[PDB]
Amino acid sequence: TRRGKIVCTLGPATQRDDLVRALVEAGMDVARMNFSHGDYDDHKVAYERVRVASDATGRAVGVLADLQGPKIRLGRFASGATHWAEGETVRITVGACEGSHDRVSTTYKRLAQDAVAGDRVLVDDGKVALVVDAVEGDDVVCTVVEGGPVSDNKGISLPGMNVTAPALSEKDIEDLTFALNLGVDMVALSFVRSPADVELVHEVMDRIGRRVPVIAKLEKPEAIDNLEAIVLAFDAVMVARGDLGVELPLEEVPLVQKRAIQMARENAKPVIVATQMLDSMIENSRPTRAEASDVANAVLDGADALMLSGETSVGKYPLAAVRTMSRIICAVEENSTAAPPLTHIPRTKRGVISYAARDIGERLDAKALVAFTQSGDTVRRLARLHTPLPLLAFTAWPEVRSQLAMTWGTETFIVPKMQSTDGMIRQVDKSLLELARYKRGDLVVIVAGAPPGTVGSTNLIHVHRIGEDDV
Amino acid sequence: TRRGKIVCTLGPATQRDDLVRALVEAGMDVARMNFSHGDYDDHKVAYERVRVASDATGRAVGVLADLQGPKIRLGRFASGATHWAEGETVRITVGACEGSHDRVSTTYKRLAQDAVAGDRVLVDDGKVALVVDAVEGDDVVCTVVEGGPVSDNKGISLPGMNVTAPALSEKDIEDLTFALNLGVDMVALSFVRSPADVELVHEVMDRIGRRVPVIAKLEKPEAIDNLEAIVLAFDAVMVARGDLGVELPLEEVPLVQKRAIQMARENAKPVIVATQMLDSMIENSRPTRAEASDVANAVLDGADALMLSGETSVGKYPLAAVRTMSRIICAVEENSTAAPPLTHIPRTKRGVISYAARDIGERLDAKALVAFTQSGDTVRRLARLHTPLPLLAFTAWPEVRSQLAMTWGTETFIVPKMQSTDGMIRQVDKSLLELARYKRGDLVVIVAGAPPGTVGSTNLIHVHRIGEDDV
Amino acid sequence: TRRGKIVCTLGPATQRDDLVRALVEAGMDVARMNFSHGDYDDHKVAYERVRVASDATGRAVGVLADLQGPKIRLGRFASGATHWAEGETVRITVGACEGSHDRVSTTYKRLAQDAVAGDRVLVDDGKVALVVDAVEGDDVVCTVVEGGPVSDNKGISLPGMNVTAPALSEKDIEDLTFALNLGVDMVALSFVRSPADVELVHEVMDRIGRRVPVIAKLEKPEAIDNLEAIVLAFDAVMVARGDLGVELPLEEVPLVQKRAIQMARENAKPVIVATQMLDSMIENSRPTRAEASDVANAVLDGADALMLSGETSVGKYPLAAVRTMSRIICAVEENSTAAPPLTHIPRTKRGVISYAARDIGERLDAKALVAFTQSGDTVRRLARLHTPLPLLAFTAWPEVRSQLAMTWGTETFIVPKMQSTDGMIRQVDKSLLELARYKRGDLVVIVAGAPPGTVGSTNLIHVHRIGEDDV
Amino acid sequence: TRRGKIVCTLGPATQRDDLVRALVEAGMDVARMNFSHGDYDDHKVAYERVRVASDATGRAVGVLADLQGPKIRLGRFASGATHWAEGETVRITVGACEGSHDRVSTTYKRLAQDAVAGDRVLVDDGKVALVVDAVEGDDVVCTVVEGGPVSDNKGISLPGMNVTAPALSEKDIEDLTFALNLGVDMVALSFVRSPADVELVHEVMDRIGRRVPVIAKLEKPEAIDNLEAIVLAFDAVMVARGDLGVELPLEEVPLVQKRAIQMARENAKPVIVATQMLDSMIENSRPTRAEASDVANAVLDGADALMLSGETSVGKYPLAAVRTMSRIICAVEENSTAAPPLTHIPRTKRGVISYAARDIGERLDAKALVAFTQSGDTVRRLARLHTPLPLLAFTAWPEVRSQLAMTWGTETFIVPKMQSTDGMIRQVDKSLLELARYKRGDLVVIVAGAPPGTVGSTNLIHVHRIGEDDV
Ligand SMILES: Nc1ncnc2c1ncn2[C@@H]1O[C@H](COP(=O)(O)O)[C@@H](O)[C@H]1O
Ligand SMILES: Nc1ncnc2c1ncn2[C@@H]1O[C@H](COP(=O)(O)O)[C@@H](O)[C@H]1O
Ligand SMILES: Nc1ncnc2c1ncn2[C@@H]1O[C@H](COP(=O)(O)O)[C@@H](O)[C@H]1O
Ligand SMILES: Nc1ncnc2c1ncn2[C@@H]1O[C@H](COP(=O)(O)O)[C@@H](O)[C@H]1O
Ligand SMILES: O=C[C@H](O)[C@H](O)[C@H](O)COP(=O)(O)O
Ligand SMILES: O=C[C@H](O)[C@H](O)[C@H](O)COP(=O)(O)O
Ligand SMILES: O=C[C@H](O)[C@H](O)[C@H](O)COP(=O)(O)O
Ligand SMILES: O=C[C@H](O)[C@H](O)[C@H](O)COP(=O)(O)O
Ligand SMILES: O=C([O-])C(=O)[O-]
Ligand SMILES: O=C([O-])C(=O)[O-]
Ligand SMILES: [Mg+2]
Ligand SMILES: [Mg+2]
Ligand SMILES: [Mg+2]
Ligand SMILES: [Mg+2]
């Protein structure tokens, strides 16, 4: 079975009866709730459907709350939608108005103040392109250079224009509050551009008295310029290639992806690769050769998880998309699970020990690597190494099973909080012997710590045969 | 400037006035003439337009004749086109008939004899899918399992069904004859499945008294099963991912590509990667993030050349497609031109010397590597290594400049046939000093042979400063 | 302090009052009792003096019983000693007789029937050389080719002559019996030439109901031809360079040494390098530059132990010899303790775990590696790796401390037989805290097993801070 | 045949009738004339005997003039010799006197001024050792701590005492003058301690209008402290282990040797390893196991040349010593000629090209590497690499054949000064075809330059079959 994790986005196409169930059964490891779209009713109903499916199948499924961030958007049109034809003049104003074809508002109130002639405007992640002709008082006069359809509240991008906007919008803070109370397992922040952006997320979490892992979505030059600092301050990163591929030259993204995955793994942080991996499966039952390649290469790059956006959220083949993504990952890993080596020898106790654990497992042809983890840290230093051996995280904290759903190669087991290392090993034997696949005598390598239930306490490797008296 | 070579396919969208010129000016290195489509008038007019553009710009442009091979195709419909809806019964007969919705002919006259119930039928490279229910005398009854439109003479694929059909069809032999007389520089054969398939191509070439380099298109299991033998018998290979991705599981293609590129380079043969690299640019001015990734990864894989099929042949943005492909390749090579190392130390005189030549060039920060070549062999053993140094092929045979248009990193220079090594070096000085970019004193490494104008005679490396008395 | 172990040979020069004490205080790790020389009184008195010095200093000192083996020797001369002058004819007979200058006996009674004209005879490890002229019935007439003095019972070598003689002589069996009852810790067998030679040693040990580790002395072509098999059947090996350098071309010995050390370490067996390492210190207070080099190079070769023969046994500077050898080893190890890498990844549980233990220790800058061992095996798989970290063997079997005296880099600690892993760790804390060098908080890596007091049970690594509650 | 070069020292034992001839015939590559001993008659007669033997055998033999340097020596004794017994008081004065047992002069006039109580005095390279008790006006009162015999003008060492003495003594300048006029090929300077010491040697050479290569003898801490600068300013280095092993701790010498050989080879300079390699062969026909080891290890260290001092100069077996040294080197090289890799990629034109030349040779199983050289530089960058292929230097300067006698693996060929590269290749064919060993067709790799007869002009590699038309 598969090692690389699959993130799916919920929306209209995953609202049909028991479709969230179908996704989980097909291999969805993480469910992305995109707070750009939908009502709190829609989110609640979706989150419910995931918990049921997770608990009914016994498949771990993390729930990821994606916060819109300071996204810039067009206003409302009198018509709901217009057609912007190559050669037409369009005014985009910071003034209040009901838009029409040639004059519409935007959410960014600093547009008049920050946009200068020659500035480019990409709509809907690149399809309709304008150039700024003039800024007259409150209006921004543009010429459509690539033509197409625009609708109410369609998103835009002003590449290289310096955008002043709080890391968390007032709407994001309410979405974050709603999501923390609802019981989501992780939070993703759009348009991160500083390591300090996590402090503001944390501030809100502390008010509400609930912290979850915070994913930095990489889709801004400032993010890549500060990749290292951000990967260290945040708990995971997403290569958000849609916005990244308009905010940077689209031809720069491939190497930024590769460099960001390598940075994540060096620091034992989850990395998701996102957006258009199987874009064509929105309309078609099979993907393009490019798409198949893109997914295979994300695996060999060393990505913890690949994500589907529109493929599952609004697509015609959300199921086929997940199944297809699964087959491709499996095809690659059958050949080899190998990842690009780390460019540093581990220095932290948990890194050194997890590295050693992998070594002993592989060299002794063990049936499993088992790590005990309170925060998931010890497990994440073993995942990044990419062994072909099963990696089994043992934890007393159910949320950590949901958190590790986006960590490479990792199945998690909830067990009572133990007061001894011998107890942890009895737990392993107990848990593992329930599965047909493990038998008494089978050799496994166990990583553990003392004093138990203490983070960073991990200090022990035990080569154990299941059920034998070797403790 | 760019090292990786770009192959474009000519068709309706590259027939508009001076568009073939625009392609060459935008960076087209090889022009594919696809003999699946078009009249001999259409091909002649296109081939003319390429020679003019090549000669008018002084950009080398190879002309590649792609032979349809034993492609299986549907017959004619009374309507020209029908709609095959998920759930419908369709008869495909080896009998002669004008088709309608529920009964149509195919070109494969062995279909009744070779198709068994449960066999799958993919149309138009996968979009419409049938399953074989029954073979009733001459008719093959199928159920549409994925629905869509079919037209006259649309191509089909019977994956894993053993197809008996000659390597060269009677139509291919006439297309090959036409193409050799027209003056094409290389020939590509569809659906190669044995190393001996090249003997039949050669046979025809010998009758006509004209041999060109023969590209094996890899798009059949038998091809990959015999990859090594084929790469040795043929002069180049194309990873033809369209048909390969229906004839094999589409999830297997990514690693077959990688393994086929590595096999090409080990044996100093050109490899093209083909089909759907920028598929979405048929309709759109920018590609998908998957597409951008697919192209970048073909470069890092070590592909001599990337190809555009429908992107240039029938697409709306043939120019943007070439420009976009060029930017992506350039983005990757700016970072590094490095390729996956070879798994063998060179053993052949030309391999050893070209390897050594690269070493001396790079270590001495030379301005250029220069190799003299009659067949292009000596040059191709340097190309596969992927140095960031300019690689300048010197030849007396104009066709060889067109042949090396699909070899990595290589610009070619036509010079008189020399009778001495000192003559070859004077030639270099003269040719190079015409370009602004080279000046007297500039350090350059020259590979040459004696007796001159003899293939495999290469036996000499000379570290030369341009215009200085060091011979 | 020093990692490489020093073996000293006892004889006349180490019989002086307190000399054996002085040797131990100067760094003697193993005391060789050479059963070629001395009577049982001399051996007893020497063995007593070693146990006292070991127990009085608390320095581990192994006692090695070196068995003469089937050594070929000259008979008795009427004069005790004669002079064999270059050019003289000498008869060496298998017949019984009192030795005249020109006619003497030998112990080898197969000489007449095994010696053919042209055969060479080296005396006293090479200094006087003869050639065989004629074999007359029972006499072997030779011509002195290199001249010098010979005495009663002087040893000879017939290089390349096939010698039929039991692996254990009648006198060896009595020396072995005497040595096992006396309480020696290891046994060395001279002139091993088959892996089965250890079976005959074991046979005697089983009769007497006492087994000790058996060292194969390598000093015969048959030994080197069977190096691997011998290293696997025996518990250690000695490169016995004196006899090896007359039985083989002396110019072959340097690489045989290197290849025999590498073979020992691959299979986790002790290797001693022996004979003439500091030969000139028999007469002189400082060695030759060659001698200094020879010792340094034995260290970099990866030798567990270097031996002194005549330097301590009959020499004028037994003390200086040990001190000097110690300074040289220390000089080398100060720079680096690094050894030639192993040509195989460990496959045995104990190899894999000890390798991993080293890794964790070095990477975490631990103060010590600690291994619990019943047979010393687990410790010996860590020793061969040559870490700069102190290596501390913990055992309940006092003999094992004496056995590990000849294992690289290893100090041993006797502790009560423990019934738990937590017990072993409390033991470590207690033993180590007695030494000034270790304090509470100091980081150490502990290797252990369960069920305890079982050989090959080793299955556990524990990163422990001394005195802290982390078990 | 052998690659590593053998330096022999001439003296009383090489004055017997055509003994110098016997040495050359046995493999002496360089003859050391030690100007510490002998008068100019003795040197002339010896130098004559070497030129005759070299010319009569056609074996290249370099002649090395070793200059005594600022060696500190005892004065004359009334008796010619006394015995200094452990426990005796000895006065060593800077005042003029005919010595006796209690009171003797020295050459060092700064002894009273520079020697303080507690200072150690080694005599005759270590055998008799004193400690300084008091300095009374002009006298240095010492206690014999190690006893033995001393004679007229015996050499002493004051380790760690700062010695003020010119790099060239007045006696050295006259020996250097005599040696340059006599026609010696190289000059060795004792007790180098600064890179500028070569400037003073050069100064004298320039006055006399003759420069030869200057060997820095390494035997002082200041030398090792400045190893790199010295190796760059001087043309070769000798590890002079006799004095180095009293001026430094003798236990430090082994690693200084290794580090000095590595430094020589990195900068393409010859390194000789000197003194006591086979010390025991002064008295004995076979060496010690240490001695055999010392020679083998000098080879694997990467030494261009091993030297014999007393073994040939005063020894009883000068011939056996050379033969024995030869067998050991040959034994090692049979197994492998491999040297410790260089820690830098070559950067100079001649380094890069010679590296490349080796590559092409080895990979194509060439019969020889051939390099054309004016100064020997191009050859010396190939030698340091240690290929198992024959290395044949071609030069028009006969002295360069004598100079390359101490460069690893190198046979030299004198040829007319050529005006073309094609000429150099004709020369090779001609010279090589005279030897039975080379035949027409045999492939060889040739390194050359233009304009010819210019140092550092080397810029060409040619893969040539002997006698074939491939130029
Ligand atoms: N079920 C458990 N009971 C007690 N401690 C646990 C349990 N599961 C994991 N741990 C602890 O998780 C710690 C490692 O935490 P971390 O450094 O966050 O991986 C180890 O010290 C384990 O003792
Ligand atoms: N312009 C030329 N005139 C004469 N020989 C050439 C010329 N160009 C290339 N060659 C020869 O091509 C040979 C190498 O051919 P190949 O083995 O096909 O690379 C070398 O011997 C070159 O000298
Ligand atoms: N003091 C001890 N008490 C109980 N077992 C010990 C003790 N010392 C060493 N051992 C055992 O030595 C075994 C290692 O055996 P070996 O494979 O011979 O190294 C470990 O499994 C330890 O349990
Ligand atoms: N016999 C020769 N006649 C002319 N030039 C030579 C001859 N031998 C060597 N050389 C040149 O000496 C230069 C090499 O000098 P070096 O850099 O000192 O080795 C090259 O240009 C060689 O071609
Ligand atoms: O947050 C801290 C970082 O993750 C570590 O400092 C870094 O990851 C080093 O980890 P290791 O030494 O375990 O690779
Ligand atoms: O056609 C022959 C193949 O190309 C060679 O056998 C292969 O290329 C190996 O040659 P090299 O030693 O130049 O890599
Ligand atoms: O006596 C047996 C040998 O020592 C082992 O079988 C061999 O040494 C393999 O051990 P490792 O895999 O631990 O090096
Ligand atoms: O005297 C100069 C030195 O030999 C060079 O600078 C040094 O040897 C580097 O040369 P290569 O780069 O050829 O090793
Ligand atoms: O021929 C092709 O290009 C294919 O099959 O993709
Ligand atoms: O000069 C020498 O040869 C020495 O000191 O060993
Ligand atoms: Mg986004
Ligand atoms: Mg095809
Ligand atoms: Mg012996
Ligand atoms: Mg000296």
String of DSSP letters for C93-104: ESS--PBPSSEE
In one-letter notation, the amino acid at residue D288 is T
In sequence order, the 6+-apart residues with CB closer than 8 A to the CB of A3 are A329, A333, A337, A386, A408, A409
Q: Which residue from C352, C363, C449 is facing A364, i.e. has the nearest CB?
A: C352
B396 close to B412: Cβ distance less than 8 angstroms: no
HEC profile of A146-212: ECEEEECCCEEECCCCCCCCCCCCHHHHHHHHHHHHHCCCEEEECCCCCCCHHHHHHHHHHHHCCCC
- For ligand 12, a single-atom ion, the residues with CB < 5 A are B 219, 240, 243
In one-letter notation, the amino acid at residue C182 is L
Measured between alpha carbons, how far is C438 from C427 in angstroms, rounded to an integer? 14
> What b-and-e string marks burial along B424-435, b requiring 16 or more CB atoms within 10 Å of the CB?
bbebbbebbeee
Task: Tell me which residue has tokens 């290891």.
Answer: C186
Q: Give whole-number Cα distances, C160 to C72, C116, C248, in Å.
A: 14, 11, 8
User: In this structure, how many other beta carbons lie within 10 angstroms of the beta carbon of residue C15?
Assistant: 15
Cβ separation C292–D327 shorter than 8 A: no
Q: Which residues pair with B446 in a beta bridge?
A: B370, B462
CA atoms A447, A452, A458, A461: torsion sign: negative
Q: What residue's CA is closest to ligand 6, atom 8?
A: B267
**Ligand 8 centre and the CA of D5: distance in Å?**
22
A196 close to A234: Cβ distance less than 8 angstroms: no
D429 close to D364: Cβ distance less than 8 angstroms: no
**Ligand 7 centre and the CA of C266: distance in Å?**
7
Cβ separation C251–D330 shorter than 8 A: yes
Q: Which two tokens stand for residue B349?
A: 């005189």
* Residue from A6, A78, A81, A66 nearest A34 by CA: A66
A232 close to A251: Cβ distance less than 8 angstroms: no
- Residue of D49, D91, D217, D384 marked active site: D217
Measured between alpha carbons, how far is B215 from B233 in angstroms, rounded to an integer? 10
| Helices A197-208 + A170-182 axis angle, to 10 | 50
In one-letter notation, the amino acid at residue C383 is A
User: In this structure, how many other beta carbons lie within 10 angstroms of the beta carbon of residue B170?
Assistant: 8
Q: Measured between CA atoms, how close is A396 to chain C, in angstroms? A: 19
User: In this structure, how many other beta carbons lie within 10 angstroms of the beta carbon of residue B398?
Assistant: 12
For testing the chain A interface, which of B157, B261, B288 should be mutated: the one with the most A CBs within 10 Å? B288
Task: Tell me which residue has tokens 């392609």.
Answer: B23
Measured between alpha carbons, how far is D464 from B86 in angstroms, rounded to an integer? 71
DSSP state of C405: G
Ligand 4 first shell, C-beta below 6 A: D 350, 372-375, 377-378, 394-396, 415, 417-418, 448-449, 452-458
Cβ separation D457–B471 shorter than 8 A: no
In one-letter notation, the amino acid at residue A212 is V
Q: Which two tokens stand for residue A191?
A: 């348009």
* Residue from B253, B248, B247 nearest B277 by CA: B253
Measured between alpha carbons, how far is C452 from C450 in angstroms, rounded to an integer? 4
Measured between alpha carbons, how far is B202 from B41 in angstroms, rounded to an integer? 26
C449 close to C460: Cβ distance less than 8 angstroms: yes
Task: Tell me which residue has tokens 């050894």.
Answer: C339
Q: Long-range CB contacts (< 8 A, 24+ apart) of C199-203? A: C200/C166, C200/C167, C200/C168, C201/C167, C201/C168, C201/C176
Q: Which helix (H) or strand (E) holds D319?
A: helix D318-335
Measured between alpha carbons, how far is A260 from A274 in angstroms, rounded to an integer? 13
- The DSSP line for B413-450 is EE-PPPSSHHHHHHHHHHHHHHSTT--TT-EEEEEEES
C393 close to A393: Cβ distance less than 8 angstroms: no
Please name which ligand lies nearest the alpha carbon of D268.
Answer: 8
Measured between alpha carbons, how far is C363 from C352 in angstroms, rounded to an integer? 17
Helix (H/G/I), strand (E/B), else coil: C358? helix
Q: What residue's CA is closest to ligand 1, atom 18?
A: A375
HSE at residue A288, side-chain half, CA atoms within 13 A, is 29
Helix (H) and strand (E) counts in chain D:
16, 21
Whether A344 and chain C come into contact, CB under 8 Å, resolves to no
Q: CA of C122: which chain D residue's CA is closest?
A: D286
Measured between alpha carbons, how far is B70 from B171 in angstroms, rounded to an integer? 10
Question: Where are any strands of DSSP class E within A352-420?
Answer: 368-372, 391-395, 410-414
In sequence order, the 6+-apart residues with CB closer than 8 A to the CB of D160 are D119, D221
**Ligand 14 centre and the CA of D222: distance in Å?**
15
Q: Which residue from B360, B450, B461 is facing D471, i.e. has the nearest CB?
A: B450
On chain A, the residues whose CB falls within 8 A of the CB of C463 are 349, 353, 459-460
B236-240 vs A443-449, strand pairing mode: unpaired
Q: Which residues of C are catalytic?
A: 32, 73, 217, 275
Measured between alpha carbons, how far is A210 from A230 in angstroms, rounded to an integer? 21
Measured between alpha carbons, how far is A264 from D63 in angstroms, rounded to an integer? 65
**Ligand 7 centre and the CA of C228: distance in Å?**
12
Q: Between chain C and chain D, how many beta carbons pairs sit less than 8 Å apart?
A: 133
C32 close to C10: Cβ distance less than 8 angstroms: yes
Task: Tell me which residue has tokens 């290389």.
Answer: B186
* Residue from A273, A281, A288, A272 nearest A318 by CA: A281
Which ranges constitute the DSSP H helices of A68-129? 111-114
Whether A345 and chain C come into contact, CB under 8 Å, resolves to yes
DSSP state of D86: T
Cβ separation B469–D457 shorter than 8 A: no
For testing the chain A interface, which of B251, B253, B255, B322 should be mutated: the one with the most A CBs within 10 Å? B251
Q: Which atom of ligand 3 has the smallest separation from the CA of C456?
A: 17
CA atoms C165, C171, C176, C177: torsion sign: positive
In sequence order, the 6+-apart residues with CB closer than 8 A to the CB of A368 are A361, A389, A390, A391, A392, A432, A438, A442, A444, A445
Cβ separation C289–D245 shorter than 8 A: yes
On chain A, the residues whose CB falls within 8 A of the CB of B276 are 288-290
Measured between alpha carbons, how far is C105 from C95 in angstroms, rounded to an integer? 7
Q: Which two tokens stand for residue B303?
A: 């592909």
Task: Tell me which residue has tokens 């690149």.
Answer: A126
- Our CA angle for C198, C200, C205, nearest 5°, is 90
In one-letter notation, the amino acid at residue C286 is R
Cis peptide before B70 (omega within 30 of 0): no
B217 close to B238: Cβ distance less than 8 angstroms: yes
Cβ separation D359–B364 shorter than 8 A: no
Q: Between chain B and chain D, how many beta carbons pairs sit less than 8 Å apart?
A: 66
Task: Tell me which residue has tokens 């190998």.
Answer: A338
Residue of D34, D193, D241 best suited for mutating to test ligand 10, as the one with most atoms within 8 Å of CB = D241
* Residue from C224, D348, C350 nearest D356 by CA: D348
Whether A353 and chain C come into contact, CB under 8 Å, resolves to yes
Which ranges constitute the DSSP H helices of C146-249? 170-182, 197-208, 221-225, 227-233, 241-247
Measured between alpha carbons, how far is A399 from A406 in angstroms, rounded to an integer? 12
Measured between alpha carbons, how far is A175 from A40 in angstroms, rounded to an integer? 9
Q: What residue's CA is closest to ligand 3, atom 8?
A: C395
> How would you classify residue C330: left for phi > 0, otherwise alpha for psi between -120 and 50, otherwise beta?
alpha
B330 close to B434: Cβ distance less than 8 angstroms: no
Question: For ligand 5, is residue A351 a contact (CB within 6 Å)?
Answer: yes
C5-10 vs A186-189, strand pairing mode: unpaired
HSE at residue B446, side-chain half, CA atoms within 13 A, is 26
Direct distance between the N- and C-terminal alpha carbons of chain A, in angstroms, rounded to an integer: 30
User: In this structure, how many other beta carbons lie within 10 angstroms of the beta carbon of residue A76?
Assistant: 14
Torsion of CA A195, A201, A206, A212, to 10 degrees: -90
D408 close to D384: Cβ distance less than 8 angstroms: yes
On chain B, the residues whose CB falls within 8 A of the CB of A295 are 290
A217 close to A190: Cβ distance less than 8 angstroms: yes
Cβ separation D460–B463 shorter than 8 A: yes
User: In this structure, how many other beta carbons lie within 10 angstroms of the beta carbon of residue C283?
Assistant: 9
Q: Give whole-number Cα distances, D1 to D291, D321, D334, D390, in Å.
A: 22, 18, 9, 9
DSSP state of A74: B
User: In this structure, how many other beta carbons lie within 10 angstroms of the beta carbon of residue B458?
Assistant: 26
Q: Which residues of B are catalytic?
A: 32, 73, 217, 275
Q: Which residue from D355, D363, D421 is facing B346, i.e. has the nearest CB?
A: D363
- Our CA angle for A310, A312, A314, nearest 5°, is 55
> How would you classify residue B383: left for phi > 0, otherwise alpha for psi between -120 and 50, otherwise beta?
alpha
The CATH architecture to which C2-69+167-332 belongs is Alpha-Beta Barrel (3.20)
Helix (H/G/I), strand (E/B), else coil: B349? helix
Q: Which residue from B245, B286, B294 is facing A126, i.e. has the nearest CB?
A: B286
**Ligand 11 centre and the CA of A241: distance in Å?**
8
> What b-and-e string marks burial along C164-202, b requiring 16 or more CB atoms within 10 Å of the CB?
ebebbbeebbebbebbbebebbbbbbbbbbbbebbebbe
Measured between alpha carbons, how far is B437 from B392 in angstroms, rounded to an integer? 13
C328 close to C358: Cβ distance less than 8 angstroms: no
Measured between alpha carbons, how far is D33 from D39 in angstroms, rounded to an integer? 11
HSE at residue A39, side-chain half, CA atoms within 13 A, is 4
On chain C, the residues whose CB falls within 8 A of the CB of D127 are 284, 286
B386 close to B337: Cβ distance less than 8 angstroms: yes
Direct distance between the N- and C-terminal alpha carbons of chain D, in angstroms, rounded to an integer: 30
Helix (H/G/I), strand (E/B), else coil: A114? helix
Measured between alpha carbons, how far is A73 from A84 in angstroms, rounded to an integer? 16
Main-chain phi, psi angles of A232, to 5 degrees: -85, -35
Q: Give the method used.
A: X-ray
Q: Which two tokens stand for residue D133?
A: 């008790």
D201 close to D187: Cβ distance less than 8 angstroms: yes
Q: Give whole-number Cα distances, B195 to B164, B199, B254, in Å.
A: 16, 8, 23
Cβ separation B289–A251 shorter than 8 A: no
Decide: C and B in contact? Rule: 3+ Cβ pairs under 8 Å: no
A106 close to A74: Cβ distance less than 8 angstroms: yes
DSSP state of A77: B
Q: What residue's CA is closest to ligand 6, atom 2?
A: B267
A59 close to A24: Cβ distance less than 8 angstroms: yes
Q: Which two tokens stand for residue D419?
A: 């005006």
Measured between alpha carbons, how far is C200 from C216 in angstroms, rounded to an integer? 13
Whether D381 and chain B come into contact, CB under 8 Å, resolves to no
In sequence order, the 6+-apart residues with CB closer than 8 A to the CB of C70 are C163, C165, C166, C167, C169, C190, C191
Cβ separation D421–B471 shorter than 8 A: yes
In sequence order, the 6+-apart residues with CB closer than 8 A to the CB of D339 are D265, D300, D302, D384, D385, D386
C466 close to C456: Cβ distance less than 8 angstroms: no
Measured between alpha carbons, how far is B10 from B48 in angstroms, rounded to an integer? 12
In one-letter notation, the amino acid at residue B125 is D
DSSP state of C88: -
In sequence order, the 6+-apart residues with CB closer than 8 A to the CB of D143 are D87, D88, D89, D90, D130, D131, D133
Taking the domains of chain C in order of start, what are their residue ranges? 2-69+167-332, 70-166, 333-465
**Ligand 6 centre and the CA of B425: distance in Å?**
27
Q: What is the resolution of this structure in A?
A: 2.5
